[PDB]
Amino acid sequence: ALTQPASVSGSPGLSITISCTATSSDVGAYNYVSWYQQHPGQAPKLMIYDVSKRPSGVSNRFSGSKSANTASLTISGLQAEDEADYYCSSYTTTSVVFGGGTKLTVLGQPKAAPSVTLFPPSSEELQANKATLVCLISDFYPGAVTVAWKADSSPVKAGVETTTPSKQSNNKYAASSYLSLTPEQWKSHRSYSCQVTHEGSTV
Amino acid sequence: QVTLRESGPTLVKPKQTLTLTCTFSGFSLSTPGGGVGWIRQPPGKALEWLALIYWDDDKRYSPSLKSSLTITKDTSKNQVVLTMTNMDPVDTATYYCARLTAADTIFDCWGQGTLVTVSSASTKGPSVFPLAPSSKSTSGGTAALGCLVKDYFPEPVTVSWNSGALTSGVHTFPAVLQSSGLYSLSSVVTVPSSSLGTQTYICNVNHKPSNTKVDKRVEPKSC
Amino acid sequence: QCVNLTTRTQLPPAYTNSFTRGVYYPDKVFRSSVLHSTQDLFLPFFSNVTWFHAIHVSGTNGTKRFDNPVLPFNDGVYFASTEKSNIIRGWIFGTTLDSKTQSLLIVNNATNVVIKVCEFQFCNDPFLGVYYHKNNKSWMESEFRVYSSANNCTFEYVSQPFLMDLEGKQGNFKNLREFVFKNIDGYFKIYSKHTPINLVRDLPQGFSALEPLVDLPIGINITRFQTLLALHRSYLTPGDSSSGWTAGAAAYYVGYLQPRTFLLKYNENGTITDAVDCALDPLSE
Amino acid sequence: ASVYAWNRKRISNCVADYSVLYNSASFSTFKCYGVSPTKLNDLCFTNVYADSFVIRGDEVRQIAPGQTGKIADYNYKLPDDFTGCVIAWNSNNLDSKVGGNYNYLYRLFRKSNLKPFERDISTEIYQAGSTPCNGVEGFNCYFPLQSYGFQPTNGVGYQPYRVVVLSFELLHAPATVCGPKKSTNLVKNKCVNFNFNGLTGTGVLTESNKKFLPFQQFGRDIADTTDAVRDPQTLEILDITPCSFGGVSVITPGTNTSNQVAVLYQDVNCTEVNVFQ
Amino acid sequence: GNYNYLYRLFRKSNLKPFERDISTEIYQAGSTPCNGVEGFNCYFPLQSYG
Ligand SMILES: *[C@@H]1O[C@H](CO)[C@@H](O)[C@H](O)[C@H]1NC(C)=O
Ligand SMILES: *[C@@H]1O[C@H](CO)[C@@H](O)[C@H](O)[C@H]1NC(C)=O
Ligand SMILES: *[C@@H]1O[C@H](CO)[C@@H](O)[C@H](O)[C@H]1NC(C)=O
Ligand SMILES: *[C@@H]1O[C@H](CO)[C@@H](O)[C@H](O)[C@H]1NC(C)=O
Ligand SMILES: *[C@@H]1O[C@H](CO)[C@@H](O)[C@H](O)[C@H]1NC(C)=O
Ligand SMILES: *[C@@H]1O[C@H](CO)[C@@H](O)[C@H](O)[C@H]1NC(C)=O
Ligand SMILES: *[C@@H]1O[C@H](CO)[C@@H](O)[C@H](O)[C@H]1NC(C)=O
Ligand SMILES: *[C@@H]1O[C@H](CO)[C@@H](O)[C@H](O)[C@H]1NC(C)=O
């Protein structure tokens, strides 16, 4: 069982140590260890293949070795970059286990303000029994914030438990939402408040 | 040399036979050490190894689903079929076709990731509908168009504007299953309303199970 | 595929004289206008050599003389071929010749001289042969029944593959290739010389050198001698697989050698023009 | 292959460059229990013998002359006067599958004794006692060919190791298999010591106009003296002439009168050593 | 095995007649310099008799 911590984040440019457990007799000698790096939405990239030596495809400052019974990929130079999920992998006596995962993030980012843009549906999906008041929530780095609706009646869910967990090229996770309504009612409602709350800027 | 092509049906029935054809080229299952295999990984969860086809026709299985796990190979067609019998409802995960090039190099090659869901709900038609700006769509200046699609159970869908020509700056972020039981996602491509009527915007929906290539142009619509 | 094809009416074989034949280069030294002598294994001049006839006469009565017997190989042999259609194309050796000693397969049907030092058990009377197909109108090789129990091999010296004509036409002889299959100190020294001839039933007189072809470093025991001739079989001539073979017209003048000193006379260009037997009439001594 | 079915790859007519193999430094061990690791690239043999077998990392010392082992005393033994060499490297890179690679085989239970250089295909069941087998896998009868498993993440003593034996046997046939005879640059118009394949001596290597025969290489003179040879690399005639030598004769008057001398380098143009030729 | 008695395996060149040879420097075999580190092609020149 290659149990890994949830998310050990640190300051950029720091040699934070990633660890997984002893991998006892179920794992014979712990000689074939390969850390992974799975970016959200893409395939994992191999940062190391052996205990110490790394492959020639993604040769970078990703260094690490096993001291006594656990491996730790220490990154010091090329640390201020994108973040992903780490996975230490090894073979057991009869099987191959990947264990848990380490969703290491880059702590420290200047937050200014999110994006609150209302996008009413055009006159194409209304008459098709598919009216939807979509709301775009983006321009915020830390995770996916929770959207709040206070459109003068009550906080209704209406199917917004998505948060769209997918980062863009700028590593900014957008917390967009949608809204399911009645077939045809446009003039009877008002501007649905989509003032999302964000860490640092509640508005 | 890396021509890994992951295929197979996404929406499958409960207790069915899953077929995952992984086509490749270059390296084959002839030199010792080279071994193709599949790795199971649920969306947002960790990874786990299921099958590993080796050069010596060795079908190494995992003890978790040893009774139901089966995989074959084809050296002539360069296609490896993973036959996961008795698809349980919990088996919904994202499979990954890899290649064990050697004992030390643990799964050098990796595929793209094909999401396979298992349920009794049948497939549905798309809901491709443009998102044109309205009179109350001006908040801070961002009034980009959209290709919101809903009313479809198969989760993996891709939106390609102009058949992969206007795909510069696409921010289409997919979503998860809603409370009703239908997925939905819209495009957040960085296209202002200024250069909207002079250029053609056609988001070709790519639905794998239903195989419906619906095309719909985008124009600024009035009230 | 070994079936015995004798079909022979043998007669007491005749013998011919060696008119200054069997002189090669004992080494690779270059000398101009030098009369250096040495103790080598050259062929003595004016000596009775063994003659084997291989002409199939089909006239009034004719004869089917087809001789390929075993010959005691003491130290060497002076091989000649006064052929006109390239009939003789094989040379095999050995001590017992039945899966006991390392044998040879020096033969060239139509491709190249495949010097394969193999240890198969070839059968007692092997023979090659070509067919005159009526559907192709060409002399192609289609018979390679020499060895039966092919075993592992030790040395391969396949030369450049080529294509001959194998035209079994009659008339006057126009080619002569001499060879010396001697072996001393485990070195199968091979000599060769292609000289044109114009004769009917006599050995050509004169002097001719013998340039070395190849020096095989294999050190096997050679105490016998066997030739492999070609059977130009045809469909117009009747017969069966045991008697329907039509031999050509050729003859090889084999001759045993012995230690004998010789007085070589190198030319100004570096070739041996004349030589003295050093054992003939007292004038030569 | 394995120790049970170790094959023999005998190749003749070689130029065996063992220097690049000794300078490779990629294998685990290279120390062989035969001739010294040096000077073996200049001695010439008749032919080379090659084998192929794998043994775990715990018995890599059982391929030495005068050793005992349950794996080596019944699969592959060493000669009493082994003079060749044995090379082995870590095979845990491409021949070790997960769960135990059962491709290779091994045999440890044999009633008879094994002789050096004796490859057997004995597959019949073995009896570990006096009771006959009669074709059963029960008591007092065990199958000799067991599963040679390869755990990919086990100790070093269990990792696979590809072993090859290079026996330098000598026979009565002339020596053919030997390594590189390196050459140097060409020297012209200078008294230098040459190291040709056939001749070794001193002299001046100049050019000439005489042409040798296509098969002839060397060349002598009337009184058995070398005059010109052919360069083995490039087909060309090189006139080999003995460089300038002679005798020094000191012509001096009476020492009571003066003390000056005048040397005379005899039969030399003295451009190679008051000058008056 | 009395390990007090040992002999030298080899050296760079042949020893002169009646000449002492007391050295610890390992033999630099191959082409890569040993730099005083023992390993491949850097065996110890001395070896016990056993
Ligand atoms: C040919 O003759 C030999 C010996 O005379 C004999 O051993 C062999 O069986 C014969 N071949 C046939 C096909 O009879
Ligand atoms: C020897 O040669 C002479 C000259 O041709 C010949 O008359 C004689 O028959 C030959 N004798 C033998 C035994 O070959
Ligand atoms: C000759 O012609 C036949 C057709 O009758 C063909 O099968 C064959 O290949 C040709 N060549 C030879 C060498 O027989
Ligand atoms: C292989 O060659 C050796 C060497 O002469 C010989 O003893 C052995 O019988 C050969 N094996 C076979 C199967 O012909
Ligand atoms: C064969 O030749 C070898 C030398 O290569 C020699 O030792 C041996 O005695 C010879 N045997 C016979 C039967 O001539
Ligand atoms: C020697 O060689 C020269 C080369 O030009 C040639 O002219 C001459 O005829 C030759 N002499 C012979 C072959 O006797
Ligand atoms: C040997 O190599 C040299 C270098 O290219 C070349 O000039 C020469 O012709 C070669 N000799 C041969 C192939 O006999
Ligand atoms: C000595 O060398 C000179 C240099 O040209 C030459 O002219 C002279 O003939 C040489 N001496 C003799 C005796 O050849």
Can you offer a commentary on this structure?
The structure is cut from a larger assembly and holds one copy of chain A (203 residues), one copy of chain B (223 residues) and three copies of chain C. Chain A has 203 residues and is mainly β. Chain A contains no helices and nine strands. In chain A, a hairpin with a 4-residue loop joins strand 3 (63-66) and strand 4. Chain A starts with 33 loop residues before the first strand and ends in a 65-residue tail after the last strand. Chain B is mainly β and 223 residues long. Helices cover 0% and strands 31% of the residues of chain B. In chain B, strands 2, 4, 5, 6, 9, 10 and 11 form a seven-stranded mixed β-sheet that branches. Chain B has a four-stranded antiparallel β-sheet with strand order 1-3-8-7, with no helix packed on it. Chain B has a three-stranded antiparallel β-sheet with strand order 12-13-15, with no helix packed on it. Chain C is mainly beta. Chain C has a four-stranded antiparallel β-sheet with strand order 4-13-14-15, with no helix packed on it. Chains in contact: A-B, A-D, B-D, C-D, D-E. At the A-B interface, strand 5, strand 6, strand 8 and strand 9 of A face strand 5, strand 12 and strand 13 of B. Bound molecules: 2-acetamido-2-deoxy-beta-D-glucopyranose (8 copies). The site of one 2-acetamido-2-deoxy-beta-D-glucopyranose has 3 residues of chain C, from loops.
CATH architecture of the domain at 7-104 in chain A: Sandwich
Which fold name fills CATH's third level, the topology of the domain at 7-104 in chain A? Immunoglobulin-like
Strand content of chain A: 15-25%
Query: How many helical elements of chain C?
Result: 0
Region (Disordered) (chain E): 9-44
Disulfide bonds (chain E): 34-42
Protein name (chain E): Spike protein S1
Region (Immunodominant HLA epitope recognized by the CD8+) (chain E): 2-10
